[PDB]
């Protein structure tokens, strides 16, 4: 039983969809999002003016 549990943990870790994937994705999107915020904000300021 212990063996099955440990192996299962490994197989789960080896799922293609993985923590690493989300981490990577997040880092990319984060950078994009921050830049987008700055960008569009400038245009909105101009719109109010």
């Amino acid at each position: 039983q212990q063996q099955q549990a440990m192996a299962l943990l490994d197989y789960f870790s080896e799922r293609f969809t993985n923590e690493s994937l989300y981490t990577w994705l997040i880092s990319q999107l984060s950078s994009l999002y921050l830049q987008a915020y700055d960008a569009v904000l400038s245009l909105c300021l101009s719109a109010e003016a």
Binding site: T23, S27, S31, L34
Partner: protein, 332 residues
């Protein structure tokens, strides 16, 4: 039976009983059959043969004997016995004892020495106090679920084995690439009709606000305040103009630029070492460094090969790894 003889001739395992005699042997290797025999019988004192070689040079040195030799006398015996038994009384390996002794005194062979009661009484002299300290700290260590090796490494008592790598090269160059991509500030960023009043970019780089490479300078935080507040203060200090509006947008620009730069670095470090972006900046200052200086060095060097890396940054990553281990072990 006598305590001594019981300890050594505890049972017969060889042809000759061990005996305490004058004379010496070349313990370093003892290739001479008799010397080897002697040393082996002494190793019969519980410990591993390999352990013996860690101890013996220290004993020889402390007792003042010739480097390659040891003698069949109580002095050697007692020194060894101290070094073995004492930590063992705390369940610590005799190996570990060396670590703790250095930690306490920057000496491993301390227990090799004879006891002393020097009138020039100093903390490094009382065997008894030192022993009591060993007791206390051992308790504290196990209490905190630590490990002497780990502790010594973290305390810098011994270096961890590391070498340059391809991936670290890739890491640095990746950083440099992304940093070059848009996030590095540029003079045209200031070129707006609203900002016509001054060459802010030059001025802010002549004052210690901006690195002309496109980086914000470091800003040491304080308990009661926050970044924009102190940026505001810095700008007010240079006092280029009273216009709150231009001032405001300048601060906005600076804030967002900094935040991008730091975010990039933070996430990168996080990805490599498994630490939160939330703590990377503080951790870096606790390591005694800062984002600005780091990135400055990065663009200043951009090593393209494993040989190209500047040792400065190599030591940076080494120290960083160390801190990461510490802050991951503790619930910081």
């Amino acid at each position: 039976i006598a305590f001594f003889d019981r300890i050594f001739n505890r049972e017969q395992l060889f042809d000759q009983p061990f005996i305490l005699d004058g004379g010496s042997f070349t313990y370093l290797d003892a290739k001479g059959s008799d010397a080897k025999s002697v040393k082996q019988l002494c190793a019969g004192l519980n410990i591993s043969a390999v352990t013996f070689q860690f101890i013996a040079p220290l004993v020889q040195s402390a007792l003042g004997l010739e480097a390659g030799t040891l003698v069949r006398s109580f002095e050697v015996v007692s020194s060894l016995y101290r070094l073995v038994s004492i930590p063992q009384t705390f369940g610590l390996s005799t190996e570990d004892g060396l670590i703790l002794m250095n930690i306490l005194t920057d000496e491993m062979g301390y227990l090799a020495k004879q006891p002393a009661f020097d009138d020039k009484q100093t903390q490094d002299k009382d065997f008894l106090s030192i022993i009591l300290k060993m007791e206390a700290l051992s308790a504290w260590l196990t209490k905190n679920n630590l490990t002497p090796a780990s502790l010594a490494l973290l305390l810098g008592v011994t270096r961890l084995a590391v070498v340059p790598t391809n991936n670290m090269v890739t890491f640095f160059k990746g950083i440099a690439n992304g940093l070059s991509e848009n996030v590095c500030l540029t003079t045209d960023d200031f070129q707006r009709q609203e900002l016509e009043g001054a060459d802010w970019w030059t001025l802010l780089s002549t004052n210690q606000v901006i690195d002309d490479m496109g980086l914000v300078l470091d800003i040491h935080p304080v308990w009661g305040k926050s970044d924009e507040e102190m940026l505001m203060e810095k700008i007010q200090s240079i006092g280029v103009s009273n216009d709150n509006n231009t001032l405001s947008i300048i601060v906005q620009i600076l804030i967002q630029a900094k935040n991008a730069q730091e975010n990039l670095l933070s996430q990168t470090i996080s990805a490599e070492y498994g630490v939160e972006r939330s703590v990377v900046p503080l951790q870096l200052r606790w390591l005694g460094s800062n984002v600005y200086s780091v990135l400055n060095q990065v663009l200043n060097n951009t090593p393209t090969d494993i040989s190209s890396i500047v040792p400065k940054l190599s030591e940076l990553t080494y120290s960083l790894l160390i801190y990461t281990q510490l802050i991951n072990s503790l619930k910081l």
